[PDB]
Amino acid sequence: GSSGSSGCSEVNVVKERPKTDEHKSYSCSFKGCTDVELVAVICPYCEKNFCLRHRHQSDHDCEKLEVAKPRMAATQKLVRSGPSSG
Ligand SMILES: [Zn+2]
Ligand SMILES: [Zn+2]
């Protein structure tokens, strides 16, 4: 065979990063929730980010709200705890 062509240039570019489908997702600040959303729903009371499902105050158990927990700390003398002689 007999042929020939011209055309070539250098190039130095740092490998491209692993593009991420998502752009920005915020995690819920509720005790018992692992849902996120594109936007960041912040509470004008506790100033925390939550999910649309738990965006409401009481919904996410807003600490600011004037409503304490329906349950108190466990304060009971453990029973059946200790070395039993025989
Ligand atoms: Zn949530
Ligand atoms: Zn709140």
Curated annotation (Swiss-Prot):
Binding site for Zn(2+) 3: C28, C33, C51, H54
Species, as recorded: Mus musculus (Mouse)
Entry keyword annotation includes Ribosomal protein: no
Known function: Plays a role in the regulation of cytoplasmic stress granules (SGs) turnover. SGs are dynamic and transient cytoplasmic ribonucleoprotein assemblies important for cellular protein homeostasis when protein production is suspended after acute exogenous stress. Associates with SGs and is involved in the efficient and specific arsenite-induced clearance process of SGs through the recruitment of the ubiquitin-selective ATPase VCP and the 26S proteasome.
Binding residue positions for Zn(2+) 2: C8
GO molecular function: proteasome binding; zinc ion binding
Domain notes: The ubiquitin-like region is necessary for its localization to stress granules (SGs) in a VCP-independent manner. The AN1-type 1 and 2 zinc finger domains are necessary for the recruitment of the 26S proteasome to SGs. Both the AN1-type 1 and 2 zinc finger domains and the ubiquitin-like region are necessary for efficient SGs clearance upon specific arsenite-induced responses.
Gene Ontology CC annotations of this record: cytoplasmic stress granule
Biological processes annotated in GO: cellular response to arsenite ion; positive regulation of intracellular protein transport; stress granule disassembly
Subunit composition and interactions: Associates with the 26S proteasome; this association occurs upon exposure to arsenite and is reduced in the presence of ATP. Interacts (via AN1-type 1 and 2 zinc fingers) with PSMD1; this interaction is increased upon arsenite treatment and occurs in an ATP-independent manner. Interacts with PSMC4. Interacts with PSMA1. Interacts (via its ubiquitin-like region) with VCP; this interaction occurs in an arsenite-dependent manner and is necessary for the recruitment of the ubiquitin-selective ATPase VCP to stress granules (SGs).
Keyword presence, Repeat: yes
Descriptive protein name: AN1-type zinc finger protein 1
Location within or outside the cell: Cytoplasm, Stress granule
Disulfide bonds: none
